[PDB]
Amino acid sequence: TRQKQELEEELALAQAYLEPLERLAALAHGLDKSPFLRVIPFLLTEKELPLVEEALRKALEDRYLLAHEAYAGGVAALVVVHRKEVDQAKAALSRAGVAELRLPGALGELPLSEAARRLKERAEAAPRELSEVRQHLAKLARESASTLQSLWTRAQDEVARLKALEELASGRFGFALLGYVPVKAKPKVEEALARHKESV
């Protein structure tokens, strides 16, 4: 139940940003970890690219490669200028409305090429993994639910006996109790009373 839920959530998070991160890593083929420029990619809305270009012109104009390539459901406006100037430019772009793609797990926590490779591997493996996990869970249910139900019935019986033992009244190494049974059921109750170890 942990593994199948984790595989389903991993498939969902991988399919949430599969193609757009691939297009961003395709567009980021010159400065992925180059030591002169950061990479703020924003899978953003429609053509407010001039409003982000206002913040890009607030950054350097002969620098800050900032454009949306493809997969325009979230238009992948990637921006690459500097370290500190790109930090100020990302702050100004978020003031104009922008967000660097900080996903959870490792896809928004690793380098985008390795993140895309791991996300592609997870999206390729998670379907067959979820199917085999569902098959294993169904087989385990069909093979163990009978013993689980028998153990649950025995445990319910033992716990009911334990709860009934609390409601007794002792007599200082003696015990006495009262109850109510039908006079039409007095024959089977008397047969069970004779079936006791003493017929008390």
């Binding site: 180059s34 350097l60 620098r63 790109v86």
Partner: protein, 62 residues
């Protein structure tokens, strides 16, 4: 592009500074080696001359 170009210009300036520092270190090392060899050769020659003079003095006394 402009920021990568400015960083490349700064990298070229740093490479020139590193080459200048290596050249200055080599020059100072050669100067110190020459001074040490000169002092050692002068000390050894003066010690040989002084030992020769003292031995000649003791031999002339004998």
């Amino acid at each position: 592009s402009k920021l990568e170009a400015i960083l490349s210009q700064e990298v070229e300036a740093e490479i020139q500074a590193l080459l200048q520092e290596a050249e200055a270190k080599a020059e100072a090392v050669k100067r110190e080696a020459e001074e040490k060899a000169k002092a050692l050769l002068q000390a050894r020659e003066r010690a040989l001359e002084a030992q020769y003079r003292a031995a000649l003095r003791r031999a002339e006394s004998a």
